[PDB]
Amino acid sequence: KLLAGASNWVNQSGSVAQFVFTPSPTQPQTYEVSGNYINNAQGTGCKGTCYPLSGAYYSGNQIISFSVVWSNASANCQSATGWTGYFDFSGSQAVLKTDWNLAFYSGSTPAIQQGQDDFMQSVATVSESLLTE
Amino acid sequence: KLLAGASNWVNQSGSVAQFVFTPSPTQPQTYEVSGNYINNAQGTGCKGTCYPLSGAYYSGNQIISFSVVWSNASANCQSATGWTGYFDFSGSQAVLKTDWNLAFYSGSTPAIQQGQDDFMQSVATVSESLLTE
Amino acid sequence: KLLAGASNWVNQSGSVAQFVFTPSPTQPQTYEVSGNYINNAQGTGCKGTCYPLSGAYYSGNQIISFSVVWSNASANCQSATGWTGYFDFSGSQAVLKTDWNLAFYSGSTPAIQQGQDDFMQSVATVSESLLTE
Amino acid sequence: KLLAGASNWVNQSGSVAQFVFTPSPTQPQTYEVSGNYINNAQGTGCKGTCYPLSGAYYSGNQIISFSVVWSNASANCQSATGWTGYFDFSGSQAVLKTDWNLAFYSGSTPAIQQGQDDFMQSVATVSESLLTE
Amino acid sequence: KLLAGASNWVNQSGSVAQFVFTPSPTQPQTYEVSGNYINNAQGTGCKGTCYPLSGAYYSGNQIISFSVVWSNASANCQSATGWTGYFDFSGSQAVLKTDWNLAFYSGSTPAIQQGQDDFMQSVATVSESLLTE
Amino acid sequence: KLLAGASNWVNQSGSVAQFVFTPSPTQPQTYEVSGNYINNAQGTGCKGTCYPLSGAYYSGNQIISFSVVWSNASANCQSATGWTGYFDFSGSQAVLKTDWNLAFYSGSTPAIQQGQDDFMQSVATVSESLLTE
Amino acid sequence: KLLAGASNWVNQSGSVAQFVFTPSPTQPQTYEVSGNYINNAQGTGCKGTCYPLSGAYYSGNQIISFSVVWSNASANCQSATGWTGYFDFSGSQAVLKTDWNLAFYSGSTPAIQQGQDDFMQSVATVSESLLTE
Amino acid sequence: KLLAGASNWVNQSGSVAQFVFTPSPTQPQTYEVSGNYINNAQGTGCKGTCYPLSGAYYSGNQIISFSVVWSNASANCQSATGWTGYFDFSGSQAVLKTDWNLAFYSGSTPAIQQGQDDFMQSVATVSESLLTE
């Protein structure tokens, strides 16, 4: 059911989605998705820093769709990605599977690449201190 | 360039995107996308009523990604569409070329169909009154 | 009694009122009315898209008055409807009996037609998906 | 055109509408109406005290529609009125003309009376002090 | 103890205070006072219409102090009053007693009159309708 | 005339009023008064720490009324001061002439002492650092 | 454990920290710190008036870091203090052990002195009135 | 002077501060600091993800102080750091120098380490796309 408050989701490239969910006033079992995305995928720019994500989550059947514009104070890749997929909380690990699309330019030549990402839940590690453990 | 205020975008199958753009407080040349989608395609669920849309827009090269959860007070199709794309405002007509992904079900069998919607800007039709024209 | 969350109300001519109720901070048993109206009557302007509605509701005896300005990103009929009425939730069906007034034009000749819409509550139709049903 | 900020409007029964106008984010040349209404009509209850009003104003052709639920901390008349009409700023005086409807109960017997009100603009009188002039 | 939500308070001149109380974040057993004041005192201007009041209420020993600037969309008396006094909820009636001060000008000649007002609680009268009872 | 931003006002007994002014949304030439009061009088409770102040100001003739509830995280004197007055910004010095009322206790014996504070504007003293001067 | 509402903390030199804690929307067991600091040390600038404080608090082991910019409507020392530390609520007394850094000037010669303040919680002193005690 | 909107600041360990500045209502030439901090310092935990920072910036002499509680959805190090230091925009590069303190526990044994960080401004790199340049 619920992963409410802040949740930490890590995909196959090291990439981190942190989701925040706020109930929608008009749309039943629908949450506004907010939070941050850290890109760590080897080929790409806009890696290692917080990009706000926006989208919508349908609780009923644990579906989601969210977007990142690859522009923040550290780096701009002049492009946008949208992720659309589903959750599966069953068992010892919780998994999100998504199909993604990415709008960009090569010349004055606009283009939409595409692909697929798989995120797994990982709960905050705890350390004695910043310095140790 | 500029769509400040609400703008009306109509796809090949007649479905309607109404966009509102709000500046991101932190993301250079990025706007939070809100507004409403009215799905008007022949063989489809959840048609002829407003679905909220949420996403993001990059004004640098006029790229967008938005999402709709198909649940409102009229009809629940327990599914999500994500659209990712770009706009060309050159010439007599402004067009939004999009690709899109749609996370839905059959049984216990999650799915994700792909597609392409192309939209054209259409400025409010004006009438003497609600009864004329 | 209670319509907490968004509710769907359909009139004789098929037009759709989606209501949201927020408690007044100061008015006993009064709610601020928001939501969306989709005008679906044969011989009319400004049909098949969401118009915002604003008004007020008295929960003591389940009375309402709301208004729509027929101007959105799709179509401007330069006019306003006001609806004033009451609800009966008794029995198998919940109905909203309304009278209404509509301020529009011809030439330089302001006008105000009268009328009566009657609405019935219809709870979200459910589908396996956006493609089925 | 503009009566922006707070405006004072007095009808034939002494009744006072104070309007506040805030531009709508989605609806072009449309304002959310807020403010207060003081009833001073001889036959009625809920006289002499502030009732919040809600509605919508279409600037284009200076049209309006607004609602009052006759419930506040001083008095409850368990009913609601909606006013729908037009402005005429021409000449030495500014005038609003409206058609109104009023939903109420007699027995378990719901009912909608009706009528018409005409409001004129009156700018704040100025006095040397509260005590004099 | 509590008169929370909206409360209706009537003094010896017919004058009406409606109070709204919101807990203070920093000041224990302290409420921000807001609401409306209707002046109906015979000698004065700024009579019969809503003036916002501002002040602070100390719950502990049911003490209060609030202010009205006699300027609104209907009338300006270019002056300000402050009321400071205490509650007594005991018995069949609830009473507020206050000492008031009023800052105004005669010539270029500034001046502070003074006086005392006594308010009694009066709960919303209820009527069959606006029209009757 | 103008005190936009925070201003510092010092009375004869050394107590400090720090004022912030916010335009009323509805009251011509009226500002909501916020800020902080530090009571510095010899023979008094609740001294040397910030008490919130709330009131209203009329910029037409530079008149004010504000209130302090003497309860904060340091000291509770279970009492309220109301100040009512006017400002003279003519000459080399800006002065705020005030009268005031103070609702406090003895036993089961509510009281309300009267008074007069006169304040002078004093613009931030500047230092090389927190350690110098 | 818990300091919900405003709390009063007094250091060895008599300076006063008034704390307010608000839950972070995203940071487990983290609170945004607001409130006011009154600097009461002998040989110092910017004393006896409220400086806003801002920082963060970790309730897991009751650790804090807050900052004051020494500029308000009374006195500008063009400098910043940062405090970093921990609380012990065991026993008859609650103490906040802190170290701190202070970024100030001489000429064109930026500096940063180090230090240690230790605070003790002191619950509001109560008085019959502002005049007694 | 100004680095207003979102700014990107990189220290000697790879660590990234993104600052957002909002003018303070009460404190002249003072900004509330907000934004995000990415830790990339070799010895430590809580590395590679967004931690909200809070503090205050004094424009006058370009001074700053801000805090991070090392707790977010990815990782908790149960500790807090405060940074206090100054800017120097002169020349071809803009530099921030800071003294930092860090509160943590070893056993039931609380402790405050300390150190110094130097951040340099780095403006958003621009890339043809996420995929290339």
Side-chain angles (χ1 to χ4, degrees), chain C residues 25-91:
Chain C
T26 64
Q27 287 188 276
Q29 300 189 292
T30 310
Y31 295 82
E32 271 331 283
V33 179
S34 55
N36 287 300
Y37 194 82
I38 305 112
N39 165 27
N40 286 154
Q42 170 38 50
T44 43
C46 294
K47 302 184 48 173
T49 88
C50 272
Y51 290 81
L53 69 72
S54 63
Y57 171 80
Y58 181 63
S59 50
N61 50 15
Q62 293 105 45
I63 299 196
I64 202 179
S65 194
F66 54 94
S67 296
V68 163
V69 163
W70 301 106
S71 158
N72 74 0
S74 307
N76 190 357
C77 297
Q78 334 179 253
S79 38
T81 305
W83 291 261
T84 307
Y86 60 101
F87 291 87
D88 177 9
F89 302 80
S90 307

Side-chain angles (χ1 to χ4, degrees), chain F residues 6-8 16 18 38-39 43-46 48-50 70 72-79 102 104-106 113 122 124-131 133, chain G residues 6-8 16 18 38-39 43-46 48-50 70 72-79 102 104-106 113 122 124-131 133:
Chain F
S7 65
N8 185 272
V16 163
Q18 285 168 358
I38 305 112
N39 165 27
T44 43
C46 294
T49 88
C50 272
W70 301 106
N72 74 0
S74 307
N76 190 357
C77 297
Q78 334 179 253
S79 38
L102 186 200
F104 64 89
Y105 264 42
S106 277
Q113 201 207 5
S122 198
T125 60
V126 179
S127 307
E128 184 182 78
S129 104
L130 190 78
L131 288 186
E133 320 154 58
Chain G
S7 65
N8 185 272
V16 163
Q18 285 168 358
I38 305 112
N39 165 27
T44 43
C46 294
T49 88
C50 272
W70 301 106
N72 74 0
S74 307
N76 190 357
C77 297
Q78 334 179 253
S79 38
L102 186 200
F104 64 89
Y105 264 42
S106 277
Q113 201 207 5
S122 198
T125 60
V126 179
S127 307
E128 184 182 78
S129 104
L130 190 78
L131 288 186
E133 320 154 58

